[PDB]
Amino acid sequence: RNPVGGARVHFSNPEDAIEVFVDGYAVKVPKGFTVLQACEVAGVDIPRFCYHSRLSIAGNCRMCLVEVEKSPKPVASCAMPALPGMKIKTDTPIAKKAREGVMEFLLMNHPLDCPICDQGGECDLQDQSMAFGSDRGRFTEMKRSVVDKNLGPLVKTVMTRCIQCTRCVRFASEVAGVQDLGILGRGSGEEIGTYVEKLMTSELSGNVIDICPVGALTSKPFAFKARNWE
Amino acid sequence: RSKKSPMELISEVPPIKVDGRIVACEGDTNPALGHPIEFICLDLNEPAICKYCGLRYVQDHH
Amino acid sequence: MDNQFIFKYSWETLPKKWVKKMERSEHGNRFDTNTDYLFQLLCFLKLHTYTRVQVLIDICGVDYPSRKRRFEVVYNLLSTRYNSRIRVQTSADEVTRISSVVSLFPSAGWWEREVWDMFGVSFINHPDLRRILTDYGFEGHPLRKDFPLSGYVQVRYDDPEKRVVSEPIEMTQEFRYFDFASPWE
Amino acid sequence: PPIRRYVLTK
Amino acid sequence: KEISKDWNTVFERSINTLFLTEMVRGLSLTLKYFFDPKVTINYPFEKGPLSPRFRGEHALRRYPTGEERCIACKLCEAVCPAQAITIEAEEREDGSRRTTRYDIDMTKCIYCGFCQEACPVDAIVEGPNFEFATETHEELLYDKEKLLENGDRWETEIAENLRSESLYR
Amino acid sequence: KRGEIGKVSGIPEEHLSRKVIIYSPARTATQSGSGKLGKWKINFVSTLKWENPLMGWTST
Amino acid sequence: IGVPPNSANLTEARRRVFDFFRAACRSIPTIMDIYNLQDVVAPSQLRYAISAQIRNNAHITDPKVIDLLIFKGMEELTDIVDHAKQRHHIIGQYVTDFLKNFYTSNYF
Amino acid sequence: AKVKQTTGIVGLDVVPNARAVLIDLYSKTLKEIQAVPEDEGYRKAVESFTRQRLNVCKEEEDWEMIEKRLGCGQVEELIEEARDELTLIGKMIEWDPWGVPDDYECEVIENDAPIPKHVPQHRPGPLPEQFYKTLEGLIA
Amino acid sequence: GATLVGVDKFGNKYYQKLGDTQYGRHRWVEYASKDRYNASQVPAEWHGWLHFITDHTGDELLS
Amino acid sequence: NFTLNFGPQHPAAHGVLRLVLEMNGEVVERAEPHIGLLHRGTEKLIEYKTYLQALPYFDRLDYVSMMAQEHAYSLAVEKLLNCEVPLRAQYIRVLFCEITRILNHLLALTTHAMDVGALTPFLWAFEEREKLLEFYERVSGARMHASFIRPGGVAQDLPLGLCRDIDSFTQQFASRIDELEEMLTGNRIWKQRLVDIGTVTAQQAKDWGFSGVMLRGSGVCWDLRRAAPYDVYDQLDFDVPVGTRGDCYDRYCIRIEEMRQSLRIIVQCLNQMPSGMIKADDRKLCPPSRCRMKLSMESLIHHFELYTEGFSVPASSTYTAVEAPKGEFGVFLVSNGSNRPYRCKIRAPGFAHSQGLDFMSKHHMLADVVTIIGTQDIVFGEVDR
Ligand SMILES: CCCCCCCCCCCCCCCCCCCC(=O)O[C@H](COC(=O)CCCCCCCCCCCCCC)COP(=O)(O)OCCN
Ligand SMILES: CCCCCCCCCCCC(=O)SCCNC(=O)CCNC(=O)[C@H](O)C(C)(C)COP(=O)(O)O
Ligand code: SF4
Ligand code: SF4
Ligand code: SF4
Ligand code: SF4
Ligand code: FES
Ligand SMILES: [Zn+2]
């Protein structure tokens, strides 16, 4: 197979290349290269919500779960480092029912504002829900809600439609270099914000628009101007 | 009358009085003939505007 | 006859050099043969006792602008007596001429003419091969992936010369192509 | 589902 | 050798083909319908029957409060097979997502109802009007004010049609 | 070079001299999936698109 | 009759070119007196026009391309022979710079 | 024991003494395809069904029993099939397509994607035993 | 005139006749004006009743 | 010999028909139709639109049997998608296919009679045809181009009062057929204007691809809904009429008998129709209910993602064929694997029938050409895609 997206694997040590079985097709990857990256090398594309290849690895949102033969529980492929001679399993009932079960929880409290979401046509949540999800839908009770707090003249925020993937927090803490965005609260009902009136004052502060998967953070100048398909 | 555009006509409707932290807005009294349901957390002292209808909801208590 | 029975018998009975590629499925039995053995294969399938393919349904054509043999003409056939449906397809080119089958099935003349009209695939010893669908003086073959949807020329009435004339196309509103294709597929 | 294919030699 | 050679039957056949019995029998049938009541209707005063599902004039509904239902979701523009709907949107100072240009080319429109059944808010509908007959071509380019005028005019009947068939689909 | 197929295509001759760009479109930043990669397209530069002076439609 | 199979060598291609040109000439008077045009154009210049059109594709080397071009030539000729082409279509069809382009448009 | 006097198909007239014209056409086909190499499957199949059809025509004279024992079509349809088979045999002889080219490659796909029960599927009835017996003879 | 069913603000009056088993002459309009009447004067409330869309008279549809 | 041309503007020749034919003064020797006057370009347009956006093109192909082409397209999509369909949807699809058969047979018969010279049956058949066009106008919006049949099931459920009205119509439709037949079968002019005209033999019809009534007229018992029954047709019992000698009159009798058989099938579907859902529960090609898209997040997501992107048919290629009233209507889909069809060739039955006009009108008179045109029931929407 060929790597998905044309990704280039840089072998800084030719001697160290552990061989793993992603789905029965053995591939060679260097030390490190967590199970997600090993599957990326072998041309297998795994769902992801919290994992960005440019930021630190976080384990929440439990969406990239796969099955390893020598593992009782499904493992987080985006965080578990590769080991020699693993028999990974992706298209398995365990690794599938894991994904529908997780995405049902993701969608149970999501608001129904798709027609007015500025990220309607390019949302990872709905695009993955169509592929890796159950169509029925079981939740019937009252959802939660979060009020919207202004920050920046160019970042329109609707935190009601925010899965707490903490990707924006990690970006602001690591790449942007200014620590103004953080995660506040505990349990079901934790919010993400500055906790004060301050706005994101950074030169590369507009990258939170793209990095956030769902339409929680969208550009304010491009508010409702057009859809992605047109 | 038709000189009042919806922009300045929806603002003349007084905000709704409701108890609780959140309220569910469906548009029409018949759920099938309204918009998708929109739970809004009305915690700020300003009225919380439904994104579909434009109706404003404010908390009677406190 | 049963679909697998046609598979087994035809594959065993047919000369081996005729069929380059062949496929069995629920969608339909397919015989991908060479461009020069097509006439002989059709003649064999028409006259053989067990496989009496007497009626030709249609002659199709698919444009693949990513392979050396760009076009692919598809011959859908039907055996009325044995209640079976066989499909024979070959590969063509912009300049390669492929033998006609009008001698076997006289109804194939119009289908070959329309294939030439749409894809520009000529047919050997075809009587009266000319454009059938597009208008008179048409330039280009519309069904190729290269041909723009709106075409190259327009039609209107000009008053200085009391006739209907043609100009290069000038669209009042361009065809808005919506790219709905998404990843995770 | 499998969509397998086997090439045949002389 | 088709034969009808019998003394009695030759007389019976040679009379039917000589006194035009078939012609008379097919002639007396039209006279039966001559005196029968007609099936036509005087169109201007009496209209033909329709259905609650009829596909006619496009209309842009609005909420009973007075705010327009269209939220510029652009599903109707994307689903329209004829590509007749053009939409332009921007965020008003109220922050609401609304349309500024929503024009339908009723000469490209095919009246299929795909746009009507794609709205998540029932913003656009196809009213029961079928009497456009404009004398000018550019009058057929409805431009979001004709839509709203149609919605205001037919609201009392579009609402009834929608609530009558809301149990379906 | 070798425009014989271009000559026999029958398309207007003035469109045979167009400059085109060949590239593989990159993955969009707003999405994380890589299911739209590895496919090459020819990019004719259709720059000229004015606005219809009746309804604002984009003519070409 | 039917379409000729192909041309293996360039000599057959040249022979077919000559045959097509000859046939087009033997068909030149019927198209002169079927479109009702006698004094507007003399039959001589149409011969030069056809010769120029044929000589235009002088750089072609593939015999198959030559064959298909000749086939298109017969198709156009046969279309013209019948009273099918629109009136006077044939006569219209068969008849520094930098500043000039700059003063008109940006796309030259 | 009576003349058919109607085929039910327009343009396909009845053939009196159909057994006579069908008993020698089969012999002509059998004696004509001797030139085809024995290792080719076409000859084996054509001989296998032609011999059985010729026999069945031999034991029984009246066309009703002939067509009931065979169970396929009518006597005139069988005659047309025999003529077409003879013409195909001649064309095969003159074409000589027998043999396998060197470094021959055949691409075979046996994908099995199920389709719903309610889409048009050409389902025929069970065949007479000779169609299967020919395939068994060919394979072994 | 078997039955007169309601009136209109424009002045055009609405009638109704009931048949037995075959359609014909069920309900029609008597337009108030005469200057070619434009063939389109029925309001939205009475448009549904006229075309057999709804069984409501139209005066009831206003309420 | 002179070569005059047709192209009459009155609907005798169904319009948009150009016929350049050479006669021997009184007797025609060769007729060469010039099709292409109605080549809209549907085949090129289908490739540019989603599998759902391309459905109404199939209404515009054969516009007397609108639901027959939608049936073929839906069956092709289902075969490519491997989607099961509930019994109620299959039964209503069969019912409306039979209604299309009745409509098309009525229109063909009375346009043929108008061409011959009979005028009365035309108006009677249209006052009948309105009573089924209103059935179409009830289940969906438009009377003619009803996009009622979707790939999954059907568009939406039948209204409450439709079955009673359909049964009431079928009560008297047989008597109406008998009244129409009274003036044509027994009439001696009708026989002399049809007998021994346009004879086609079964071998020659097979050679020219005359699948349909033109095949069964020649004595071939070939019915696509008996040989390859697709929807619920094994349960329904009906007889397949077969002609004895096919010449412009056994075809007419076969069309009468097929109208009666369609009436019988409609009665059977009405009596045997079950209750249940109408659209498949796959929810990949079927949209959620309007009450569910406004209450459930997954339902709204699916609605949004199938009313813009549409369903993606897995990469394959199939040929499906259904027994359209004209004949064998076949749709050949080639699926790229995306949400748009790569190639959709449409096998119009009228193409081969119009091709076979040249030999059928051999050594006939000029007045025996309009009857050949009428007796094959050609419409140029399908002939010129
Ligand atoms: C009440 C006042 C009414 C006043 C009006 C009078 C009634 C008019 C009614 C007209 C209604 C029908 C009109 C149709 C017009 C066209 C019909 C012509 C058909 C036709 O000519 O048929 C022919 C017979 O007609 C004929 O033969 C017709 C002539 C009748 C011959 C006489 C019949 C009985 C003779 C007994 C004599 C008794 C006295 C002996 C002492 C032969 O038809 P074909 O073509 O099939 O033939 C095969 C030979 N190629
Ligand atoms: C009213 C008119 C009706 C028909 C109008 C048709 C108008 C277009 C005619 C067809 C246009 C074509 O390209 S169709 C014919 C195309 N064939 C070729 O271009 C041959 C390539 N040239 C050569 O072989 C030699 O150079 C050659 C120049 C022949 C001699 O030169 P020499 O011996 O030194 O070698
Ligand atoms: S973020 Fe995605 S799932 Fe949520 S409302 Fe927006 S488009 Fe829909
Ligand atoms: S705001 Fe966006 S990036 Fe930050 S946690 Fe929420 S969804 Fe993730
Ligand atoms: S689908 Fe309805 S709400 Fe959305 S843009 Fe169109 S008219 Fe407006
Ligand atoms: S009815 Fe159909 S064609 Fe017309 S605007 Fe609506 S979706 Fe577009
Ligand atoms: S993407 Fe790996 S756990 Fe979230
Ligand atoms: Zn609301």
CB I12 within 8 A of CB I27: no
CB E151 within 8 A of CB E104: no
Give the number of the ligand closest to the Cα of residue A173. 4
Distance (Å) from the alpha carbon of J150 to chain B's nearest alpha carbon: 23
| A122 contacts F34? CB cut-off 8 A | no
In total, how many domains does chain J have? 1
C-alpha gyration radius of chain B? 13
Distance (Å) from the alpha carbon of A114 to chain E's nearest alpha carbon: 8
With residue J221 as reference, give the H or E element that holds it: none
Residue J294 is part of which domain span? 18-383
Distance (Å) from the alpha carbon of E121 to chain B's nearest alpha carbon: 5
The C-alpha atoms of residue J90 and residue J229 are separated, in whole angstroms, by: 12
Give the number of the ligand closest to the Cα of residue A53. 7
Pocket test for ligand 4, best of A167, A184, A190 (most atoms within 8 A of CB): A167
Give the dihedral of Cα atoms A193, A197, A201, A206; nearest 10 deg: 40
Best mutation target among I51, I52, I56, I63 (most E Cβ atoms within 10 Å) is I51
CB J298 within 8 A of CB J171: no
Compute CA distances J74 → G82, G104, I38, J54, J133, whole Å.
44, 53, 43, 11, 22
Residue from the list B6, B32, B36 with its beta carbon closest to the beta carbon of E67: B6
Q: Name A135's Cβ contacts closer than 8 Å, sequence gap at least 6.
A: J282, J283, J284, J298, J302
Q: How many CB atoms lie within 10 A of CB F20?
A: 9
Q: Name J208's Cβ contacts closer than 8 Å, sequence gap at least 6.
A: C106, C107, J200, J352, J355, J356, J359
Nearest to E117 by CA among E151, E144, E153, E81: E81
Backbone φ and ψ for G12, nearest 5 degrees, come out as -65, -35
Answer positive or negative: Cα dihedral of J279, J282, J287, J292: positive
Pocket test for ligand 3, best of A103, A107, A108, A113 (most atoms within 8 A of CB): A113
The pair of three-digit structure tokens given for residue I32, joined into one six-digit string: 């108030």
The C-alpha atoms of residue E29 and residue H35 are separated, in whole angstroms, by: 72
C-alpha of J311 from chain center: 26
The C-alpha atoms of residue J177 and residue J128 are separated, in whole angstroms, by: 10
The C-alpha atoms of residue J38 and residue G3 are separated, in whole angstroms, by: 28
Chain H residues with CB inside 8 Å of D3's CB?
109, 111, 113
Binding-site positions of A for [2Fe-2S] cluster: 50, 61, 64, 78
Closest protein CA for atom 7 of ligand 3: A120
Chain F residues with CB inside 8 Å of A52's CB?
32
How far is the centre of ligand 6, averaged over its atoms, from the C-alpha of E58 (Å)?
Answer: 9
| E50 contacts I53? CB cut-off 8 A | yes
| F32 contacts A124? CB cut-off 8 A | yes
CB C132 within 8 A of CB C110: yes
Residue J172 lies in a domain: yes
Residue ranges of alpha helices (H) inside C88-184 are 108-119
Nearest to D8 by CA among H40, C19, C35: C19
Nearest to A112 by CA among B26, I49, C96: B26
Nearest to C13 by CA among A86, H49, H21, E142: H49
Backbone φ and ψ for J352, nearest 5 degrees, come out as -70, -35
Compute CA distances J313 → A132, J303, J319, whole Å.
17, 17, 15
The C-alpha atoms of residue E81 and residue E87 are separated, in whole angstroms, by: 15
Give the dihedral of Cα atoms C13, C15, C20, C22; nearest 10 deg: -10
Q: Measuring from each residue's beta carbon to the nearest atom of ligand 5, which residues come in under 6 Å?
A: E 70-76, 87, 118-119, 121, 123-124
Q: How many CB atoms lie within 10 A of CB A28?
A: 13
Give the number of the ligand closest to the Cα of residue E74. 5
Answer positive or negative: Cα dihedral of C181, C183, C185, D5: positive
Which residues on adjacent β-strands are paired with residue J32? J20
Q: Is E66 on the interface with B (CB under 8 A)?
A: yes
The C-alpha atoms of residue C172 and residue C39 are separated, in whole angstroms, by: 48
Which residues on adjacent β-strands are paired with residue C22? C31, H108
Q: E81 in ligand 6 pocket by Cβ < 6 Å?
A: yes
CB C33 within 8 A of CB H115: no
Nearest to H40 by CA among D8, C14, C8: C14
Name the DSSP class of A176. I
The C-alpha atoms of residue J80 and residue J151 are separated, in whole angstroms, by: 11
The pair of three-digit structure tokens given for residue C113, joined into one six-digit string: 């003419």
Residue ranges of alpha helices (H) inside chain J are 42-46, 66-81, 87-116, 120-139, 162-182, 188-194, 202-207, 213-216, 224-227, 250-272, 290-293, 297-307, 349-355, 357-360, 367-376, 380-383
CB E91 within 8 A of CB E100: no
Q: G58 in ligand 2 pocket by Cβ < 6 Å?
A: yes
Closest protein CA for atom 3 of ligand 5: E70
Answer positive or negative: Cα dihedral of B20, B25, B29, B30: negative
The C-alpha atoms of residue J273 and residue J265 are separated, in whole angstroms, by: 12
Question: Relative to the CA of A167, which ligand 4 atom is closest?
Answer: 3
Closest protein CA for atom 14 of ligand 1: E23
The C-alpha atoms of residue J213 and residue J191 are separated, in whole angstroms, by: 19
Best mutation target among A135, A144, A160, A228 (most J Cβ atoms within 10 Å) is A135
| E47 contacts I24? CB cut-off 8 A | no
Name the DSSP class of J107. H
Q: Is C149 on the interface with F (CB under 8 A)?
A: no
Backbone φ and ψ for J219, nearest 5 degrees, come out as 95, 10
CATH topology of domain E57-165: Alpha-Beta Plaits (3.30.70)
The pair of three-digit structure tokens given for residue G48, joined into one six-digit string: 């030069």
The C-alpha atoms of residue F47 and residue F49 are separated, in whole angstroms, by: 6
| I28 contacts E128? CB cut-off 8 A | no
Residue J268 lies in a domain: yes
CATH no. for B6-59: 2.60.260.40
The C-alpha atoms of residue C40 and residue C34 are separated, in whole angstroms, by: 11
Q: A79 in ligand 3 pocket by Cβ < 6 Å?
A: no
Interface of C with J (CB under 8 A): 27-28, 54-58, 60-63, 74, 76, 78, 80, 83, 85, 87, 105-107, 109-111, 118, 132-135, 142-143, 147, 149, 175, 177-178, 180-182, 185
The pair of three-digit structure tokens given for residue A102, joined into one six-digit string: 């997780």
Interface of H with C (CB under 8 A): 40-42, 45-46, 49, 73, 77, 81-82, 84-85, 87-88, 91-92, 95, 97-101, 104-115, 121-124, 127, 131-132, 134-135, 138-139
User: Please, which experimental method was used?
Assistant: cryo-EM
Q: Name I18's Cβ contacts closer than 8 Å, sequence gap at least 6.
A: I2, I3, I26
The pair of three-digit structure tokens given for residue C69, joined into one six-digit string: 């043999």
Which of helix, strand or coil describes residue E101? strand
Residue J65 lies in a domain: yes
Which residues on adjacent β-strands are paired with residue A219? A155
The pair of three-digit structure tokens given for residue C153, joined into one six-digit string: 């020329």
Residue G87, judged by CB atoms within 10 A of its CB (0-12, 13-18, 19+), counts as: middle
Q: Could you tell me the strand order of the sheet in which B16-18 lies? A: B16-18, B56-59, B48-49
| A116 contacts B41? CB cut-off 8 A | no
Which residues on adjacent β-strands are paired with residue E60? E124
CB J326 within 8 A of CB J212: yes
DSSP string, J241-278: ---SS-SSSHHHHHHHHHHHHHHHHHHHHHHH---S-S
The C-alpha atoms of residue C53 and residue A184 are separated, in whole angstroms, by: 75
Answer positive or negative: Cα dihedral of C95, C98, C100, C101: negative
Which of helix, strand or coil describes residue C112? helix
| B37 contacts A115? CB cut-off 8 A | no
CB J87 within 8 A of CB J232: yes
The C-alpha atoms of residue C51 and residue C48 are separated, in whole angstroms, by: 5
The C-alpha atoms of residue A32 and residue A68 are separated, in whole angstroms, by: 17
Pocket test for ligand 2, best of G53, G83, G91 (most atoms within 8 A of CB): G53
The one-letter amino acid code at E56 reads G
The one-letter amino acid code at A23 reads D
Structural domain boundaries of chain G? 1-108
The C-alpha atoms of residue A170 and residue A182 are separated, in whole angstroms, by: 9
Neighbours of chain G (3+ CB pairs under 8 A): C, F
Nearest to B29 by CA among B6, B7, B1, B53: B53
CATH of the domain at J254: 1.10.645.10
The C-alpha atoms of residue E4 and residue J55 are separated, in whole angstroms, by: 56
Neighbours of ion ligand 8 (CB under 5 A): B 25, 27, 50, 52-53
Residue J201 lies in a domain: yes
Chain A residues with CB inside 8 Å of B41's CB?
144-147, 160
Compute CA distances J340 → J46, J50, J307, whole Å.
8, 5, 13
Give the 3-state secondary structure percentages of chain G, helix then strand then coil, rounded to 5. Answer: 65, 0, 35
Which of helix, strand or coil describes residue A218? strand
| F57 contacts E138? CB cut-off 8 A | no
CB J255 within 8 A of CB J213: yes
| H135 contacts C8? CB cut-off 8 A | yes
Q: How many CB atoms lie within 10 A of CB C64?
A: 15
Interface of E with C (CB under 8 A): 78, 83, 86, 105
Segments of chain A assigned E as strands: 18-21, 26-29, 65-68, 75-76, 88-89, 155-157, 182-184, 191-193, 217-219
Segments of chain E assigned E as strands: 58-60, 85-91, 97-105, 124-126, 141-142
The C-alpha atoms of residue C135 and residue C147 are separated, in whole angstroms, by: 16
Buried b or exposed e, range J51-77, using 16+ CB within 10 angstroms:
bbbbbbbbbbbbebbbbbbbbbbbbbb
CB J40 within 8 A of CB J385: yes
Q: E15 in ligand 1 pocket by Cβ < 6 Å?
A: no
C-alpha of H78 from chain center: 8
Residue from the list J82, J83, J228 with its beta carbon closest to the beta carbon of H120: J228
Nearest to C79 by CA among C27, C26, C42: C42
